[PDB]
Design an enzyme around this catalytic site. Structure first.
Site, mmCIF file in Angstrom:
data_model
loop_
_atom_site.group_PDB
_atom_site.id
_atom_site.type_symbol
_atom_site.label_atom_id
_atom_site.label_comp_id
_atom_site.label_asym_id
_atom_site.label_seq_id
_atom_site.Cartn_x
_atom_site.Cartn_y
_atom_site.Cartn_z
ATOM 1 N N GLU A 1 0.807 -1.213 0.000
ATOM 2 C CA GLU A 1 0.000 0.000 0.000
ATOM 3 C C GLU A 1 0.847 1.274 0.000
ATOM 4 O O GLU A 1 0.588 2.189 -0.769
ATOM 5 C CB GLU A 1 -0.939 0.046 1.216
ATOM 6 C CG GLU A 1 -2.074 -0.977 1.217
ATOM 7 C CD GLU A 1 -3.097 -0.775 0.108
ATOM 8 O OE1 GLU A 1 -3.105 0.308 -0.529
ATOM 9 O OE2 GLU A 1 -3.910 -1.692 -0.107
ATOM 10 N N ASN B 1 -7.558 9.835 -5.741
ATOM 11 C CA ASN B 1 -8.262 9.048 -6.742
ATOM 12 C C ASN B 1 -9.162 10.029 -7.447
ATOM 13 O O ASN B 1 -10.267 10.343 -6.976
ATOM 14 C CB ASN B 1 -9.103 7.974 -6.064
ATOM 15 C CG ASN B 1 -8.287 7.109 -5.131
ATOM 16 O OD1 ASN B 1 -7.370 6.394 -5.567
ATOM 17 N ND2 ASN B 1 -8.591 7.168 -3.839
ATOM 18 N N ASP C 1 -13.075 9.227 -8.150
ATOM 19 C CA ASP C 1 -14.213 9.408 -7.263
ATOM 20 C C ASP C 1 -14.020 10.507 -6.224
ATOM 21 O O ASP C 1 -14.781 10.606 -5.275
ATOM 22 C CB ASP C 1 -14.609 8.081 -6.606
ATOM 23 C CG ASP C 1 -13.666 7.651 -5.485
ATOM 24 O OD1 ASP C 1 -12.476 8.005 -5.491
ATOM 25 O OD2 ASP C 1 -14.131 6.933 -4.587
ATOM 26 N N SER D 1 -11.835 10.895 -3.813
ATOM 27 C CA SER D 1 -11.445 10.500 -2.466
ATOM 28 C C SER D 1 -9.924 10.398 -2.441
ATOM 29 O O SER D 1 -9.296 10.351 -3.497
ATOM 30 C CB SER D 1 -12.071 9.148 -2.102
ATOM 31 O OG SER D 1 -11.473 8.087 -2.839
ATOM 32 N N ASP E 1 -6.509 8.350 -0.370
ATOM 33 C CA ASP E 1 -6.024 7.261 0.482
ATOM 34 C C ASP E 1 -4.913 7.866 1.340
ATOM 35 O O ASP E 1 -4.039 8.575 0.826
ATOM 36 C CB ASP E 1 -5.470 6.123 -0.377
ATOM 37 C CG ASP E 1 -6.518 5.519 -1.283
ATOM 38 O OD1 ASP E 1 -7.661 5.345 -0.832
ATOM 39 O OD2 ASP E 1 -6.210 5.232 -2.451
ATOM 40 N N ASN F 1 -8.990 5.024 2.999
ATOM 41 C CA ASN F 1 -9.826 5.913 2.190
ATOM 42 C C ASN F 1 -10.733 6.908 2.943
ATOM 43 O O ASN F 1 -11.451 6.549 3.876
ATOM 44 C CB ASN F 1 -10.663 5.057 1.227
ATOM 45 C CG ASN F 1 -11.268 5.860 0.093
ATOM 46 O OD1 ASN F 1 -12.450 6.159 0.111
ATOM 47 N ND2 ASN F 1 -10.467 6.188 -0.910
#
Ligand SMILES: [Cl-]
Ligand SMILES: [Cl-]
Ligand code: NA
Length: 130
Positions: free
Chosen positions: A35, A46, A49, A51, A53, A60
């Site tokens: 990750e 991202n 959408d 959002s 991380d 998220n």
């Protein structure tokens, strides 16, 4: 902060991650590795959408933490997403425990499915003394 492998392994054990909701320490190590590369300040937007991380576990903002700019988001961990960018991972760990408390468990992270599930993950904890 960019954690060293065994340093992180020992820290997660102390924070009680070994076997949490059936997930071995080696699986948590595999997840952190893929990750963020064990980097606590890693952030990933991202654009698809809107959002982001956050942190070592790439949690998220749509469901887990609040950053104020993600549309129709909730804050299940009840934390500012900023908390997930500290060198001290206590908060990120408390939130990851919350994430896996949902039915999907560790599968919530698609990366775990791609790179950890059904694989020999022993290598992540070998020689760390945990
Ligand atoms: Cl906070
Ligand atoms: Cl907040
Ligand atoms: Na949120």
């Amino acid at each position: 902060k960019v954690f060293e492998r065994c340093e992180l392994a020992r820290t997660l054990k102390r924070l009680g991650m070994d076997g949490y909701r059936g997930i071995s320490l080696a699986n948590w190590m595999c997840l952190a590795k893929w990750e963020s590369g064990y980097n606590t300040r890693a952030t990933n937007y991202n654009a698809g959408d809107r959002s982001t991380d956050y942190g070592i576990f790439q949690i998220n903002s749509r469901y887990w933490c609040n950053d104020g700019k993600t549309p129709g988001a909730v804050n299940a961990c009840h934390l500012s997403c900023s908390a997930l960018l500290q060198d001290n991972i206590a908060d990120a760990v408390a939130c990851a425990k919350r994430v896996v408390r949902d039915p999907q468990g560790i599968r919530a992270w698609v990366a775990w499915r791609n790179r950890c599930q059904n694989r020999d993950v022993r290598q992540f904890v070998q020689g760390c003394g945990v």
